[PDB]
RNA sequence: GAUGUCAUACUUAUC
RNA sequence: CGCUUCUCGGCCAAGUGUAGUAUCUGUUCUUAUCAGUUUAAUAUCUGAU
């Protein structure tokens, strides 16, 4: 009720798997954008810099798994 | 506003046996008119008494101003009267 | 508190106003209600401490005497990073005993 | 001499015939008279 | 008694097509008889080994497909 | 009923032997119905006889019958009726429940307890009847309307909570549609109650949720009554939510600026009161909010006189600290003459408004002290310092606040020279107000400005006020203590003159005079050590050592408090009443049935055990530890917290070998508030002394075949672990098989105690490498989360929150795995709650501990960022 | 195993 | 009343109020199908023979 409205990503008993997967992907993107080690590993894995990787992580926050079902 | 545990009668435990009726009437009559006072005259009920007042507020003020009163060399206690606790010996 | 399940907290934005405790609830925690090993003070909100509500008790609501603080079990469990632990509504607690 | 009333490890009474529990001593003596106790005595 | 048969799920007709379409008067009784000697002797005629994948298998064709898929 | 006279037979039948004298019953066991309440329960006197003549509404008569158990029945019967009506509120319906509760609460022969029980039954049936009382919103609002304007604060708080619950349950459209014809009513009190209910609904449902409706109600020009009701609702919303109003100030100010311009003076006064209230709350310092409002207010205060000018002056005094320094200096230079001209006003409301504005008019720079002492303070002393102002509390507290503000602004000596003449008056209320003002001036400013020509007169006035006290108020003793603390070393030719008065007041026929003298000796006990007075304190202690024979227990508790203050202000082993002749003297004094006297005796016993434990021969402590078990089970919450500390001090002094056996023997009592206190005392004794010596003995109390003793031993172990914390890493292997065996018991209380002990061991040994015992206890605590009791569920939630912080969030996510998509909803809801608690505890730790999910056909769930490796 | 009346007992440092 | 001697004794009915909860005691469904709500699956309720 109020816990799902105050803190997003908690869930309830009628939560589907797609919303939980989208919340887990958003939490993983926030942990990658927050921690410097994950951003450095993502910048060393590809040829892009830290700003391009941060823009690609911020642009993928809107529906990271796809359309809902 | 009064709790339901208070009543018109109040019990006293560990009372001196050498106390007269005039001293008990003076100690019980300080908070109001005392209707009746019964002292125990039994070896199994020695040191206990029951003082019933005419007013409920006067009985509550007497029970609030007698718990731990200075007496002879014993530790007297004043408590409220209970129907289930007074007939525990039977 | 933990004794009354009908008590609700404010859960607002905690500012710089430090919480206070009365003489009857001095030393006890706000959430865990423990009087052993204090770790961090409680931060009140802006609406819970304004005007006549400044320097009052968070649990009971009377005049404050000492400073309010949380126990050591609440600082490690991330219970002090929540909102203001101020009791606003008093339901089925210290209300029927005054009328009886 | 009732062979069904026993003492548990928590200071209570246990009837193994009907498999019932009783906290005080006055509830074990009043559990022998009833419908379920008579049914357990007649079935066994 | 009717209360012990209605509360425990008894007196409910269930069909088991593996053991010659036998009858079972309970879901928990059928789950207990699935891991038993009679269901193992019924499944040994078709050639399926007694494992944990065929515990909830009732039809013979579904059990044969589960044995052929593994 | 409790004050009815009884005969001699009823008095003799209620006394045991061995004492020397010096149809009207509805359906059986229902309680006695009142003769004036035979209208609502008229269908209960006859038999039911349910045989093809029982409609559904007759079951609503059962909803009346439980009400017969709720109005004047037994409190267990009332609790059973409340439990039957709360769990069956959805099946009975809100319709017949409201139709039976509405004439019962509107009876003219009701009481306070019956109205409180009806309000509690309406609030308890409001959580299950959500979105169903929308036709019954007006019938509840008409009954909850006089509850907010009541005299008692608890009934007003209950009415405000009921109004907030009704606003949260009925939404915003139904409350606006129900209160819409209640604004243009002819009754002013009903309109004020409807405005207060609308303000409570706007505070409970948000300010912009009711802001355009209030703007449309205030901007409509049809009658002055609707505008006055809207202004009163805006003033009540500004006075209820100070912080919430501040953001809405700009809006609220734009609606309040439209008023105070019509021909009706009542609407202008209501708009001025709303602006004053707004200034107090909305935009507390928002001068701009009052900008477009400061221009007509000065014109209305300068062009007219009366109640509207007083309201405009109050609004100007409330908005004057909310402006700049130059604006406040310009406003204070043009409002001092209007405040001096209104000092001779015969109206009490205008005088109260002037006294409230005088405290805010001089609170910063701009107002000189000489002009305030010459032309402002003599009219404030001649027009406000009267005898009629001390009768009302609102007229006395505001006057005391204005006097404190004048003493803080101008000076404390000029107020002390004029307030000392009223200390020896013939009125008790005026003398108490003067003593409170002197105490506030001594606490805020001090006594440095007082010379030697006024300190003796102030001390004589304080002595005359303390010696001629007729009430039981502690204001005079606190004022004398504050005056002594402000004096300090300046009261050195005053200690014999106070001691000769205290010794004379300690021996009197009255009982409150000795208690007042002991309280004055206790309040002035800290001023004797700082003034190099050691013989007088010893003489007072020797007098109070023999003053324990006062028959009044309120005087004996005050004498014990004075003795404790004298023992705290002086040395423990350097007292002329020494500890060798006082600790046996207090051993029969600790067996008192009072609350404050027993608390003072327990505090004195704890101080004697902490600071004077070497003054006994180790024999009286073992006798007093057995009497300390009878000091608990008291409804005061003060002696039970000191008795555990006294038992811990006795166990630290005499060795933890004798008190532990008494604490284990006193654990089997089968009484409430007697087993938790002994467990807390045993935990305090184990935390003060070595916890290993009480380690096998705590394993012994679980060996006895008893549930209460095992529960008390588990509670003592949990409290000792919570008091130890990081010191419990060495006592975890000894408590691990006991916690493993206690969790497998059939009793839910023992499982809850084992879960609490596991949560204490998890919160205490977190980060020490003790994850093996936590993972072993989590395997047994995991079937304990499916219980139906809320206390066991809360204990399991606390154990899970401890194990998620101790063993790590990964183990908590692995234990809660495969339960979010469970078929059974009763376990899926608990798994979702555990997952939400683990996410609120540690959200960043669930990224690396998340399981691998395969991608679907339309959506992808595989984390391609973490799956790559360099 | 559920239901509704009665009794006993337990817990949350509740007052 | 002051001094000396003998003996004895002392010290170093615990209540009320609020929140939840585990048990027997006093009683009930052998109604044979269909459709709907709900339940993981039972149980239960609602209309037609």
Swiss-Prot record, chain A:
Record localization: Nucleus
Residue(s) carrying N6-acetyllysine: 6
Alphabetically ordered keywords of this record: Acetylation, mRNA processing, mRNA splicing, Nucleus, Phosphoprotein, RNA-binding, Spliceosome
Domain of life according to the entry: Eukaryota
GO cellular component term of the entry, any: U2-type precatalytic spliceosome
Site positions for Interaction with RNA: 9
Primary site of residence: nucleus
Assembly: Component of the 17S U2 SnRNP complex, a ribonucleoprotein complex that contains small nuclear RNA (snRNA) U2 and a number of specific proteins. Part of the SF3B subcomplex of the 17S U2 SnRNP complex. SF3B associates with the splicing subcomplex SF3A and a 12S RNA unit to form the U2 small nuclear ribonucleoproteins complex (U2 snRNP). Within the SF3B subcomplex, interacts directly with SF3B1 (via HEAT domain) and SF3B3. Component of the minor spliceosome, which splices U12-type introns.
Name of this chain's protein: Splicing factor 3B subunit 5
From Swiss-Prot, chain B:
A GO CC term attached to the entry: U2 snRNP
UniProt cross-link Glycyl lysine isopeptide (Lys-Gly) (interchain with G-Cter in SUMO2), position: 18
N6-acetyllysine: modified positions: 18, 30
Swiss-Prot/TrEMBL GO biological process terms: blastocyst formation; mRNA splicing, via spliceosome; U2-type prespliceosome assembly
Keyword terms: Acetylation, Isopeptide bond, mRNA processing, mRNA splicing, Nucleus, RNA-binding, Spliceosome, Ubl conjugation
Chain positions covered by the region annotation Interaction with pre-mRNA branch site: 5-18
UniProt keyword Kinase, yes or no: no
Regions that span the bilayer: none
Domain RRM: 8-83
Location(s), subcellular: Nucleus
GO MF: mRNA binding; RNA binding
Subunit (UniProt): Component of the 17S U2 SnRNP complex, a ribonucleoprotein complex that contains small nuclear RNA (snRNA) U2 and a number of specific proteins. Part of the SF3B subcomplex of the 17S U2 SnRNP complex. SF3B associates with the splicing subcomplex SF3A and a 12S RNA unit to form the U2 small nuclear ribonucleoproteins complex (U2 snRNP). Within the SF3B complex interacts directly with SF3B1. Component of the minor spliceosome, which splices U12-type introns.
Primary role: Component of the 17S U2 SnRNP complex of the spliceosome, a large ribonucleoprotein complex that removes introns from transcribed pre-mRNAs. The 17S U2 SnRNP complex (1) directly participates in early spliceosome assembly and (2) mediates recognition of the intron branch site during pre-mRNA splicing by promoting the selection of the pre-mRNA branch-site adenosine, the nucleophile for the first step of splicing.
Protein family: Belongs to the SF3B6 family.
Name assigned to this protein: Splicing factor 3B subunit 6
Organism of this sequence: Homo sapiens (Human)
Entire protein: shown range: 12 to 101 of 125
UniProtKB/Swiss-Prot annotation, chain C:
Site residues by UniProt (Interaction with SF3B3): 16
Modification Phosphoserine occurs at: 93
Phenotype when changing residue 35 to C: No apparent effect on cell growth, localization of SF3B1 protein or formation of nuclear speckles
Binding site for Zn(2+) 2: 22, 25, 57, 60
Keywords: Acetylation, Activator, DNA-binding, Metal-binding, mRNA processing, mRNA splicing, Nucleus, Phosphoprotein, RNA-binding, Spliceosome, Transcription, Transcription regulation, Zinc
One Pfam match: PHF5
N6-acetyllysine modified-residue sites: 2
Site residues by UniProt (Interaction with RNA): 99
GO biological process: mRNA splicing, via spliceosome; positive regulation of DNA-templated transcription; stem cell differentiation; U2-type prespliceosome assembly
Presence of keyword Transcription regulation: yes
InterPro entries in alphabetical order: PHF5 (IPR005345)
Subcellular location: Nucleus; Nucleus speckle
Entry's Gene Ontology cellular component terms: nuclear matrix; nuclear speck; nucleoplasm; nucleus; precatalytic spliceosome; spliceosomal complex; U12-type spliceosomal complex; U2 snRNP
Function per UniProt: Component of the 17S U2 SnRNP complex of the spliceosome, a large ribonucleoprotein complex that removes introns from transcribed pre-mRNAs. The 17S U2 SnRNP complex (1) directly participates in early spliceosome assembly and (2) mediates recognition of the intron branch site during pre-mRNA splicing by promoting the selection of the pre-mRNA branch-site adenosine, the nucleophile for the first step of splicing.
Assigned protein family: Belongs to the PHF5 family.
Protein name: PHD finger-like domain-containing protein 5A
UniProtKB/Swiss-Prot annotation, chain E:
Compartments (UniProt record): Nucleus speckle; Nucleus
Tissue: Ubiquitous.
Zinc fingers (Matrin-type) by residue: 14-45
Stated family: Belongs to the SF3A3 family.
Function: Component of the 17S U2 SnRNP complex of the spliceosome, a large ribonucleoprotein complex that removes introns from transcribed pre-mRNAs. The 17S U2 SnRNP complex (1) directly participates in early spliceosome assembly and (2) mediates recognition of the intron branch site during pre-mRNA splicing by promoting the selection of the pre-mRNA branch-site adenosine, the nucleophile for the first step of splicing.
Assembly and interaction partners: Component of the 17S U2 SnRNP complex, a ribonucleoprotein complex that contains small nuclear RNA (snRNA) U2 and a number of specific proteins. Part of the SF3A subcomplex of the 17S U2 SnRNP complex which is composed of three subunits; SF3A3/SAP61, SF3A2/SAP62 and SF3A1/SAP114. SF3A associates with the splicing factor SF3B and a 12S RNA unit to form the mature 17S U2 small nuclear ribonucleoprotein complex (17S U2 snRNP). Identified in the spliceosome 'E' complex, a precursor of the spliceosome 'A' complex. Identified in the spliceosome 'A' and 'B' complexes.
Protein name (Swiss-Prot/TrEMBL): Splicing factor 3A subunit 3
Organism encoding this protein: Homo sapiens
Lineage: Eukaryota, Metazoa, Chordata, Craniata, Vertebrata
The gene coding this protein: SF3A3
């Amino acid at each position: 009720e109020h816990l799902q409205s105050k803190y997003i990503g908690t869930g309830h008993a009628d939560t589907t798997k797609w919303e939980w997967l989208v919340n887990q992907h958003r939490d993983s993107y926030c942990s990658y954008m927050g921690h410097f080690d994950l951003l450095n590993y993502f910048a060393i894995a590809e040829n892009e810099s830290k700003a391009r990787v941060r823009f690609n992580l911020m642009e993928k926050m809107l529906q990271p798994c796809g359309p809902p079902a | 506003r009064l709790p339901p545990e208070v009543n018109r009668i109040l019990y006293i435990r560990n009372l001196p046996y050498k106390i007269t009726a005039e001293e008990m009437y003076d100690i019980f009559g300080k908070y109001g008119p005392i209707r009746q006072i019964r002292v125990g005259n039994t070896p199994e009920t020695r040191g206990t008494a029951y003082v019933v007042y005419e007013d409920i507020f006067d009985a509550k003020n007497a029970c609030d101003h007698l718990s731990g009163f200075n007496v002879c060399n014993r530790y007297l206690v004043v408590l409220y009267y209970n129907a289930n606790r007074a007939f525990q010996k039977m | 508190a933990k004794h009354h399940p009908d008590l609700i907290f404010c859960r607002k934005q905690a500012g710089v106003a430090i919480g206070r405790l009365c003489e009857k609830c001095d030393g006890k925690c706000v959430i865990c209600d423990s009087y052993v090993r204090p770790c961090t003070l409680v931060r009140i909100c802006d609406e819970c401490n304004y005007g006549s509500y400044q320097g009052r008790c968070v649990i009971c609501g009377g005049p404050g005497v000492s400073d309010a603080y949380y126990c050591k079990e609440c600082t490690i469990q991330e219970k002090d990073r929540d909102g203001c632990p101020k009791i606003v509504n008093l339901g089925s607690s210290k209300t029927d005993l005054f009328y009886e | 001499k009732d062979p069904y009333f026993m003492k548990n490890h928590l200071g209570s009474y246990e009837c193994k015939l009907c498999l019932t529990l009783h906290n005080n001593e006055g509830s074990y003596l009043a559990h022998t008279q009833g419908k379920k106790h008579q049914t357990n005595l007649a079935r066994r | 008694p009717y209360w012990l048969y209605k509360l425990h799920g008894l007196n409910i007709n269930y069909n088991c097509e593996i053991c010659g379409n036998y009858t079972y008067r309970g879901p928990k009784a059928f789950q207990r008889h699935f891991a038993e000697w009679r269901h193992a002797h019924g499944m040994r005629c078709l050639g399926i080994p007694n494992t944990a994948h065929f515990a909830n298998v009732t039809q013979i064709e579904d059990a044969v497909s589960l044995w052929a898929k593994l | 009923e409790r004050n009815r006279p009884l005969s001699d037979e009823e008095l003799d039948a209620m006394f045991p032997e061995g004492y020397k004298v010096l149809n009207d019953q509805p359906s059986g066991n229902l309680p006695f119905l009142k003769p004036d309440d035979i209208q609502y329960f008229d269908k209960l006197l006859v038999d039911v006889d349910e045989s093809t003549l029982s409609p559904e509404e007759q079951k609503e008569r059962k909803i009346m019958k439980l009400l017969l158990k709720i109005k004047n029945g037994t409190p267990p019967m009332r609790k059973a009726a409340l439990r039957q009506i709360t769990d069956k509120a959805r099946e009975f319906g809100a319709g017949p429940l409201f139709n039976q509760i509405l004439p019962l609460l509107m009876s003219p022969t009701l009481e306070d307890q019956e109205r409180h029980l009806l309000v509690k039954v309406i609030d308890r049936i409001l959580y299950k009847l959500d979105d169903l009382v929308r036709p019954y919103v007006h019938k509840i609002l008409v009954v909850i309307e006089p509850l907010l304007i009541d005299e008692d604060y608890y009934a007003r708080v209950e009415g405000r909570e009921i109004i907030s619950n009704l606003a949260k349950a009925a939404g915003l459209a139904t409350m606006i549609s129900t209160m819409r014809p209640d604004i243009d009513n002819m009754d002013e009190y009903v309109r004020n109650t409807t405005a207060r209910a609308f303000a409570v609904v706007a505070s409970a449902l948000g300010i912009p949720s009711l802001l355009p409706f209030l703007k449309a109600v205030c901007k409509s020009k049809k009658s002055w009554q609707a505008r006055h009701t809207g202004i009163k609702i805006v003033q009540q919303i500004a006075i209820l939510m100070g912080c919430a109003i501040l953001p809405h100030l700009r809006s609220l100010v734009e609606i309040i600026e439209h008023g105070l311009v019509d021909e009706q003076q009542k609407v202008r006064t209501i708009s001025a009161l709303a602006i004053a209230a707004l200034a107090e709350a909305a935009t507390p310092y928002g001068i701009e909010s009052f900008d477009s409002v400061l221009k007509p207010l000065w014109k209305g205060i300068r062009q007219h006189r009366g109640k509207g000018l007083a309201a405009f002056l109050k609004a100007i005094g409330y908005l004057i600290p909310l402006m700049d320094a130059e604006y406040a200096n310009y406003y204070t230079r043009e409002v001092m003459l209007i405040l001096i001209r209104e000092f001779q006003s015969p109206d009490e409301e205008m005088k109260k408004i002037v006294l409230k504005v005088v405290k805010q008019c001089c609170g910063t720079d701009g107002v000189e002290a000489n002009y305030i002492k010459t032309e402002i303070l003599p009219p404030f002393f001649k027009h406000f310092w009267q005898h009629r102002m001390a009768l009302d509390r609102r007229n006395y507290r505001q006057l005391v606040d204005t006097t404190v503000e004048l003493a803080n602004k101008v000076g404390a000596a000029e107020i002390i020279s004029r307030i000392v003449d009223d200390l020896k008056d013939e009125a008790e209320q005026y003398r108490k107000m003067v003593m409170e003002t002197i105490e506030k001036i001594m606490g805020n400013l001090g006594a440095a400005d007082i010379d030697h020509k006024l300190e003796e007169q102030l001390i004589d006035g304080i002595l005359y006020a303390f010696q001629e006290q007729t009430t039981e108020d502690s204001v005079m003793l606190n004022g004398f203590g504050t005056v002594v603390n402000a004096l300090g070393k300046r009261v050195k030719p005053y200690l014999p003159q106070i001691c000769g008065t205290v010794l004379w007041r300690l021996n009197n026929k009255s009982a409150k005079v000795r208690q007042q003298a002991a309280d004055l000796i206790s309040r002035t006990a800290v001023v004797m050590k700082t003034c190099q007075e050691e013989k007088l304190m010893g003489h007072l202690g020797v007098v109070l050592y023999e003053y324990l024979g006062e028959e009044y227990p309120e005087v004996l508790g005050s004498i014990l408090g004075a003795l404790k203050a004298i023992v705290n202000v002086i040395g423990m082993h350097k007292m002329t009443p020494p500890i060798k002749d006082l600790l046996p003297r207090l051993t029969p004094i600790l067996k008192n049935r009072h609350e404050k006297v027993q608390e003072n005796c327990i505090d004195l016993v704890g101080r004697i055990a902490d600071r004077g434990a070497e003054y006994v021969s180790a024999r009286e402590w073992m006798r007093i530890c057995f009497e300390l078990l009878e000091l608990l089970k008291a409804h005061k919450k003060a002696i039970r917290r000191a008795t555990v500390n006294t038992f811990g001090y006795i166990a630290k002094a005499i060795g933890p070998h004798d008190v532990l056996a008494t604490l284990l023997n006193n654990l089997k009592v089968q009484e409430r508030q007697n087993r938790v206190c002994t467990t807390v005392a045993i935990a305090i004794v184990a935390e003060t002394c070595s916890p290993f010596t009480v380690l096998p003995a705590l394993m012994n109390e679980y060996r006895v075949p008893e549930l209460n003793v095992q529960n008390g031993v588990l509670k003592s172990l949990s409290f000792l672990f919570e008091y130890i914390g990081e010191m419990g890493k060495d006592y975890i292997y000894a408590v691990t098989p006991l916690l493993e065996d206690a969790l497998m018991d059939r009793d839910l209380v023992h499982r809850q105690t084992a879960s609490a002990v596991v949560q204490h061991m998890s919160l205490g040994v977190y980060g020490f490498g003790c994850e093996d015992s936590l993972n072993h206890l989590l395997n047994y605590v995991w079937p304990n989360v499916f219980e139906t009791s809320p206390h066991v569920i809360q204990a399991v939630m606390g154990a899970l929150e401890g194990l998620r912080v101790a063993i790590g969030p990964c183990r908590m996510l692995q234990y809660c795995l495969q339960g979010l998509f469970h078929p059974a909803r009763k376990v899926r809801d608990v798994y979702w709650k555990i997952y939400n608690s683990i996410y609120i505890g540690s959200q960043d730790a669930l990224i690396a501990h998340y399981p691998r999910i395969y991608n679907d056909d339309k959506n992808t769930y595989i984390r391609y960022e973490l799956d790559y490796i360099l």
